[model samples]
Target: GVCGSVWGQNDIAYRCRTCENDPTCAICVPCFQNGDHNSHDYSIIYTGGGCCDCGDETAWKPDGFCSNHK
Candidate 1:
């Protein structure tokens, strides 16, 4: 999906995707490969302004939990 801007308290910020796609397969591998996801944090990607951290893995839930937990 395309990226969109969301207006926040101070300024415009990139919106959280929040499991828009198949967040499990989309994020699980890459996050695990990159040593980002685990039993505790899972895969949490922070979007900064116009840039997003997760790429295709942006589908992770708002609270940073994957589909298995959600």
Candidate 2:
């Protein structure tokens, strides 16, 4: 994920999984930060966009965000 205006690269990495016995149950959660972007770190709440279940071969949604995890 890239942010900012010029050369602003906002990279995000998270761990998530699909609900047991539910192929449509996929989630995108946050991962712990390790000595990176702490001074100017910010959490962006993705809402309803992109494809979180790409690993499972799914279409992209316009209403998917990190906030939807919880």
Candidate 3:
């Protein structure tokens, strides 16, 4: 996964149920498009907090992590 910041106006965010541990995991728009999470189940989130977990090993399994972060 590609660990990155989260929040801001028009900053599209996503929550991947496949990688989620707690309530869910977050990913930025760029990282979302750059990763293979689309194939899995995900949802759009407009709120902020809980920075991007795209690259967090604890947050996402091997198959769920982004290529750049892996």
Candidate 4:
């Protein structure tokens, strides 16, 4: 295995539970970029972060689309 130093936003959090509802899971870039995780929902990964479209609960979108999206 390639052992290197960890820095920056190197941490990614997600929930798999074997594809079932889970509390949440954090993984490294390696594991998050490839392997079994590819089958997981892209939203599950903590990629920098996202905004919320609280204007509509059912149609909430991330980033420049939140309730206070100005």
Alpha-carbon RMSD to native, per candidate: 10.9, 12.6, 2.3, 14.6
Summarize candidate 1's per-residue lDDT along 1-70 as a digit string, tens digits. Answer: 2122232333422222343344222333322344323344333443332322333334544334323332
- The TM-scores of all predictions, comma-separated, are 0.20, 0.20, 0.73, 0.27
lDDT of 4 by residue, 1-68 (tens): 22122323534444343332233323344433333444545445553532221222233222212123
The list of candidate 4 runs beyond 4 A from truth reads 1-21, 44-70
lDDT of 3 by residue, 1-70 (tens): 3576767765668877877765666777667777777567788887645578777777766666666777
Angstrom error at residue 21, model 4: 6.3
Clashes of 4: 2
Instruction: Mark the regions of model 3 whose C-alpha exceeds 4 Å error after superposition.
Output: none
Name the weakest run of 10 consecutive residues (lDDT summed) in model 1: 1-10
* Tens-digit lDDT string for candidate 2 (1-70): 3111111124333322221123232323331222123333234433333334322323222122222221
lDDT of 2 at 9: 29
- TM-score of structure candidate 1: 0.20
lDDT (CA) per prediction: 0.34, 0.28, 0.71, 0.32
